[PDB]
Amino acid sequence: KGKSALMFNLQEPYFTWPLIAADGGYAFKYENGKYDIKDV
Amino acid sequence: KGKSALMFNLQEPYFTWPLIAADGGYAFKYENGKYDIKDV
Amino acid sequence: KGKSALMFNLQEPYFTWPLIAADGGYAFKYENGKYDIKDV
Amino acid sequence: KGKSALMFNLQEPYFTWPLIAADGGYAFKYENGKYDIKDV
Amino acid sequence: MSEQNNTEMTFQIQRIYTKDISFEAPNAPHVFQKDWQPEVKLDLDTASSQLADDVYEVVLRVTVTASLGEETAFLCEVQQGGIFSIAGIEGTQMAHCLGAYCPNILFPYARECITSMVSRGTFPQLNLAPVNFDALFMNYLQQQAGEGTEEHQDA
Amino acid sequence: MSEQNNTEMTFQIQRIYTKDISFEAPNAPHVFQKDWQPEVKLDLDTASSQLADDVYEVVLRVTVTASLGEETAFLCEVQQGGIFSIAGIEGTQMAHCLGAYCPNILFPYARECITSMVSRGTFPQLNLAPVNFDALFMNYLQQQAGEGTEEHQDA
Amino acid sequence: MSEQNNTEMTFQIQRIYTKDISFEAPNAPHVFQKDWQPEVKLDLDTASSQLADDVYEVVLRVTVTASLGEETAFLCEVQQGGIFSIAGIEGTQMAHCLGAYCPNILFPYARECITSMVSRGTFPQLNLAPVNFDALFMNYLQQQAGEGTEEHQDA
Amino acid sequence: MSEQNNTEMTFQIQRIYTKDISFEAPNAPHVFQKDWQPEVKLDLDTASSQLADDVYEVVLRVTVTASLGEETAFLCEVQQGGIFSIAGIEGTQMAHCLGAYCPNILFPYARECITSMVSRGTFPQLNLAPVNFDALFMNYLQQQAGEGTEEHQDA
Numbered sequence: 001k002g003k004s005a006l007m008f009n010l011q012e013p014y015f016t017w018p019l020i021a022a023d024g025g026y027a028f029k030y031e032n033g034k035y036d037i038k039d040v
Numbered sequence: 041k042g043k044s045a046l047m048f049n050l051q052e053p054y055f056t057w058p059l060i061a062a063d064g065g066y067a068f069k070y071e072n073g074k075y076d077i078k079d080v
Numbered sequence: 081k082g083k084s085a086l087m088f089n090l091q092e093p094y095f096t097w098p099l100i101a102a103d104g105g106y107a108f109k110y111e112n113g114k115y116d117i118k119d120v
Numbered sequence: 121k122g123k124s125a126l127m128f129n130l131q132e133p134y135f136t137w138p139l140i141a142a143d144g145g146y147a148f149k150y151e152n153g154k155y156d157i158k159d160v
Numbered sequence: 161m162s163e164q165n166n167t168e169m170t171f172q173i174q175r176i177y178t179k180d181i182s183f184e185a186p187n188a189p190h191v192f193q194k195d196w197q198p199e200v201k202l203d204l205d206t207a208s209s210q211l212a213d214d215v216y217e218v219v220l221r222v223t224v225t226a227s228l229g230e231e232t233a234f235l236c237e238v239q240q241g242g243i244f245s246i247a248g249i250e251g252t253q254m255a256h257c258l259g260a261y262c263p264n265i266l267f268p269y270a271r272e273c274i275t276s277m278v279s280r281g282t283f284p285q286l287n288l289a290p291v292n293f294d295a296l297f298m299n300y301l302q303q304q305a306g307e308g309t310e311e312h313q314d315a
Numbered sequence: 316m317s318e319q320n321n322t323e324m325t326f327q328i329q330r331i332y333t334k335d336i337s338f339e340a341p342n343a344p345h346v347f348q349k350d351w352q353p354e355v356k357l358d359l360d361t362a363s364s365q366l367a368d369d370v371y372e373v374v375l376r377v378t379v380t381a382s383l384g385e386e387t388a389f390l391c392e393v394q395q396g397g398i399f400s401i402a403g404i405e406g407t408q409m410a411h412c413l414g415a416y417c418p419n420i421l422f423p424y425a426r427e428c429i430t431s432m433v434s435r436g437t438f439p440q441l442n443l444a445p446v447n448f449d450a451l452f453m454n455y456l457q458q459q460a461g462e463g464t465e466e467h468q469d470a
Numbered sequence: 471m472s473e474q475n476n477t478e479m480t481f482q483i484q485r486i487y488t489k490d491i492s493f494e495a496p497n498a499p500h501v502f503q504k505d506w507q508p509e510v511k512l513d514l515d516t517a518s519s520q521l522a523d524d525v526y527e528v529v530l531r532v533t534v535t536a537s538l539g540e541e542t543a544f545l546c547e548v549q550q551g552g553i554f555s556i557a558g559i560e561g562t563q564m565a566h567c568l569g570a571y572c573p574n575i576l577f578p579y580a581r582e583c584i585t586s587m588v589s590r591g592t593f594p595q596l597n598l599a600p601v602n603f604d605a606l607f608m609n610y611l612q613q614q615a616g617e618g619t620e621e622h623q624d625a
Numbered sequence: 626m627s628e629q630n631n632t633e634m635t636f637q638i639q640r641i642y643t644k645d646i647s648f649e650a651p652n653a654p655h656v657f658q659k660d661w662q663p664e665v666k667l668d669l670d671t672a673s674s675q676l677a678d679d680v681y682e683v684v685l686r687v688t689v690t691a692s693l694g695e696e697t698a699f700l701c702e703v704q705q706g707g708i709f710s711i712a713g714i715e716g717t718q719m720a721h722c723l724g725a726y727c728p729n730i731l732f733p734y735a736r737e738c739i740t741s742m743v744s745r746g747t748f749p750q751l752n753l754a755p756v757n758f759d760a761l762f763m764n765y766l767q768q769q770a771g772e773g774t775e776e777h778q779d780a
Contacts, residue, residue: 120605
């Protein structure tokens with residue numbers, strides 16, 4: 001029933017929500033590059 | 041080329057220096073083994 | 081319009097969402113100026 | 121004795137840095153005005 | 161009172177980003193003596209492109225126009241593309257997902273990128289009030305749909 | 316179901332906005348010394364507040380942590396607050412909505428706010444996957460049924 | 471640390487990045503009770519640190535206070551850090567770089583970041599307008615021009 | 626703001642804004658699958674337009690053409706226009722301050738506008754190293770014909 005919710009009222013821990021296991025397959029691990037370090 | 045002490049007309053550029061540019065570094069690979077939610 | 085998937089239509093349950101329209105009142109603060117940079 | 125160029129402990133940041141206080145002449149109006157939200 | 165479609169739906173986000181950005185202020189010097197009363201309105205335009213099987217790029221063009229009559233205030237447009245790996249989507253739930261929800265995932269990014277461009281053009285930027293299409297639709301409908309949301313719980 | 320008339324139940328958003336934004340990178344100059352292998356945490360939290368009669372506020376606390384082993388790279392906590400003026404609801408179904416559905420409205424805008432903070436700190440985009448707990452909950456209620464019925468065109 | 475002001479000098483960027491963000495809107499819902507602009511007022515603050523020999527890290531902190539009538543609207547603050555390689559500069563030369571040049575590099579990024587966070591809480595534009603302190607400096611210590619005879623050029 | 630010709634050397638910075646912005650990502654998700662460093666072509670160009678006596682807008686075109694392998698990575702351009710109250714100017718000093726110093730002010734703001742669009746396209750931060758091209762040419766002015774008022778003005 002219903003179409004909405006207000007208030008808070010944590011009466012009972014309904015169900016389980018373990019979220020997303022935020023673990024992937026790496027990224028740019030820096031790697032010693034260069035941009036040419038000196039202006040003037 | 042032709043101009044006065046006060047102002048000018050933009051007939052052409054003149055003050056144009058070659059900028060330093062980027063070089064072969066590395067800062068790519070923004071995930072690849074993206075974690076799933078569950079099934080839903 | 082059409083489809084760019086194996087399944088995609090979006091005509092009947094695809095209603096027009098509001099695109100908003102906020103009126104900017106009338107006349108901006110331009111006369112003396114108190115937000116610009118004058119000092120020199 | 122001693123290497124490196126000069127270095128500092130932040131001795132007097134410039135000959136003062138003055139700025140403007142606030143201006144723009146903005147307003148809201150929930151009655152079909154701006155920066156508001158007159159209920160979707 | 162409940163026609164089961166048994167739609168599974170597996171939604172996974174891959175990557176979000178601006179494909180295209182632009183800011184047009186033709187009257188940019190002239191704005192110093194203009195009128196402050198524009199129709200600041202955002203335009204959600206929906207396109208897509210197949211990258212692979214079950215991998216589809218949704219490109220939502222948001223366009224914020226600002227006009228004072230004959231004098232234009234500014235124009236800004238950000239075509240926010242989003243890679244989404246989806247499968248199992250069916251019934252009304254597919255049209256509710258890639259025809260409202262997935263563009264709404266792209267909506268804040270595009271909206272903020274426009275708010276960026278307007279700030280850069282020294283105009284009164286803001287992140288405009290969220291156009292809650294979902295709330296209106298679920299409120300509207302016609303029929304009570306059915307008694308699908310009827311169950312207590314266990315633990 | 317001859318009762319085709321709405322009761323005191325209605326879902327209505329009055330305003331979505333960030334009440335707090337916090338990006339911390341105390342080891343930001345120190346990160347260059349460390350290798351980029353980020354272990355990402357998501358700490359999910361919410362709060363409610365009564366602004367008026369039937370007028371409530373649900374604030375979403377998303378916390379986004381990037382830890383390089385025992386060395387923090389950055390942190391991103393955004394309180395994406397949303398006013399909802401609703402009534403007529405109770406039981407276990409209200410817990411489903413304020414616990415999942417109402418912060419889900421706020422979650423695209425929270426995600427974006429963080430993602431932009433991350434990229435402004437010159438770090439790579441982080442796309443937080445949305446958890447479709449709503450569908451998981453409906454599987455228990457009645458599996459899935461999506462009978463669409465158009466009538467209310469536009470307003 | 472030399473004090474004479476007559477050396478070749480040298481500058482270089484290693485990295486620009488946001489270290490800290492704050493947008494704290496305590497009376498964020500009360501913006502719906504307050505029908506008028508918040509008084510949004512700037513603050514500049516100078517925080518820096520040394521990473522290594524000739525390798526500094528200058529943090530530009532712009533703090534922002536805003537208030538609706540007799541009440542606070544929001545309170546924002548950004549810390550745009552930047553690793554700058556400085557050598558040769560001394561006394562007035564170095565006070566000119568760390569106190570005008572390095573700020574004016576980080577300053578567009580601090581501006582764009584604040585004015586974004588402000589608008590995320592559905593508030594209007596406030597980006598800090600740029601000041602040519604260098605133009606004041608050249609007259610303050612009297613640099614003059616290349617005294618001789620002017621050219622016309624003909625083309 | 627308010628400046629008349631009845632004055633000696635003057636330099637006020639009235640207003641800095643973006644007139645034109647563009648960002649394009651043609652092979653945008655293809656480039657995600659192509660993990661290398663985008664080689665960017667930075668094209669320097671300048672413009673001017675008189676707004677009043679001793680008042681003009683100098684526009685800085687910073688064009689960016691990024692490529693990966695044998696294909697395009699992304700395109701970008703920002704025409705950062707800025708209003709400057711200039712006077713007490715003549716010869717190679719006038720030409721230099723117009724063609725070098727005025728774009729040098731606009732350059733942190735042009736650079737940042739691009740840096741943001743690159744990070745919004747979820748590509749690596751593009752910050753052009755701050756090269757004082759003004760000071761480089763500045764030495765050549767007082768070693769040629771240019772700037773009137775005869776030398777030997779000293780004891």
